[PDB]
Amino acid sequence: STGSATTTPIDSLDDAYITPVQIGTPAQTLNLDFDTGSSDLWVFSSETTASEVXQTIYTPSKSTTAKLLSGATWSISYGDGSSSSGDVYTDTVSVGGLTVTGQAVESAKKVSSSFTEDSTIDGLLGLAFSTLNTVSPTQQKTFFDNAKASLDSPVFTADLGYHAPGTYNFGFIDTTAYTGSITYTAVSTKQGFWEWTSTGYAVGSGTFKSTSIDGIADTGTTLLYLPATVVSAYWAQVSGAKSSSSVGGYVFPCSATLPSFTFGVGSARIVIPGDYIDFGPISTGSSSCFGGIQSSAGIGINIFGDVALKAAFVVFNGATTPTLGFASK
């Protein structure tokens, strides 16, 4: 079997992307944030504290196929300080025509203020390795792990758009969605992420520096976070750019024509256009814009988030020894 679903930006800045998911019998359709940096499928529900709901909710008592997982609870927090917690059902879950039976669906009893405040996101669908799942006492498998037995190939692909709709595919590689060939690179699962080592970088039309950069492929993070010396070399080529203590990163004039940024995948090269690195104005009508490349010093890990991934066709190969592929598009 295979599945194919459309993913859409939530707002005019590409802050995040939503994808429809069918849960239960008859199907209840929710719009979820597909996140390769975490491993929980959790939803707003009929159980969520009513003052913390502003979203479409899942009602397990209206689904003939829902089963309570007795004794099981969950609790998660993210790098931006957001959090949620609750109890666990198993139910039928479909994405893009691909159906999985027995999937763990984590029903929120409570959500943090940043989730209440975002009307467009009805929950998360995690796609990192199942060792990061927060269900206790026994961790639960991701939607991808449960689908692998039936899929035509144990793979999924991410094709995110720049201010435009895109695609998540399960079980096949669409050879019409990219240019050139895919280059594959080794993955370490020791921290539970799609973790890999880039071979180096170049700024604009300058020289490629061979310096190893260990980082993660993370569809749930908006920006590209890289070492302080690398980020300083990029903004040195932008004449109005400066670090702002009060705004929280590099800022520059919205009228600038920014240089591209190239990262290495083995011997291959992925080019992020300069326009993708202009995140947008600090407020509507400002002359100052926030940068899409920022230092990873305060995070402690390098993160290839949406600014980087939307410049590529990305293959998440979930064979027993996993690998990560990148192609130009």
Ligand X SMILES: CC[C@H](C)CNC(=O)CP(=O)(O)[C@H](CC(C)C)NC(=O)[C@H](Cc1c[nH]c[nH+]1)NC(=O)[C@H](Cc1ccccc1)NC(=O)OC(C)(C)C
Q: b/e for 181-219, b at 16 or more Cβ within 10 A? A: ebbbbebeeeebbbbbbbbbbbbeeeeeeeeebebbbbb
Question: 45 an active-site residue?
Answer: no
Residue that is written with structure tokens 């039936």 in the block: 150
**Considering only residues 37, 259, 318, 325, which one is a binding residue for ligand X as defined by CB under 6 A?**
37
Using CB under 6 A, count the residues that bind ligand X. Answer: 21
**Considering only residues 14, 87, 91, 118, which one is a binding residue for ligand X as defined by CB under 6 A?**
118
The phi, psi pair for 145, rounded to 5°, reads -55, -45
- Preceding amide of 253 cis, omega within 30: no
195-198 vs 213-217, strand pairing mode: antiparallel
> By rule CB under 6 A, what string of x and - marks binding of each residue 231-270 to ligand X?
----------------------------------------
Q: Are 249 and 232 in contact (CB under 8 A)?
A: no
Question: 198 an active-site residue?
Answer: yes
Give the nearest distance from C-beta 26 to ligand X in angstroms: 29
**Considering only residues 14, 31, 33, 315, which one is a binding residue for ligand X as defined by CB under 6 A?**
33
Give the nearest distance from C-beta 264 to ligand X in angstroms: 22
Question: Using CB under 6 A, which residues numbered 205 to 234 contact ligand X?
Answer: 218, 220-223
Determine the Cα–Cα distance for residues 34 and 11; give it in Å rounded to an integer.
Answer: 16
Strand order in 302-304's β-sheet? 195-198, 213-217, 302-304, 224-226, 293-295
**Considering only residues 2, 22, 52, 78, which one is a binding residue for ligand X as defined by CB under 6 A?**
78
Q: According to the binding rule CB under 6 A, does residue 299 interact with ligand X?
A: yes
Give the nearest distance from C-beta 162 to ligand X in angstroms: 16
Determine the Cα–Cα distance for residues 244 and 285; give it in Å rounded to an integer.
Answer: 19
Determine the Cα–Cα distance for residues 96 and 106; give it in Å rounded to an integer.
Answer: 20
Q: Select from 29-37, 50-58, 87-95, 229-237 the region that touches ligand X (CB under 6 A).
A: 29-37
Helix/strand number for the chain, H first, E second: 5, 25
**Considering only residues 59, 82, 185, 243, which one is a binding residue for ligand X as defined by CB under 6 A?**
82
Catalytic residue (choose from 45, 84, 198, 296): 198
Upper half-sphere CA count for residue 244 (Cβ side, 13 Å): 15
Catalytic residue (choose from 33, 35, 118, 218): 35
Give the nearest distance from C-beta 45 to ligand X in angstroms: 18
Active-site residue set: 35, 198
Binding site for ligand X (CB under 6 A): 15-16, 33, 35, 37-38, 76, 78-80, 82, 118, 121, 132, 218, 220-223, 299, 303
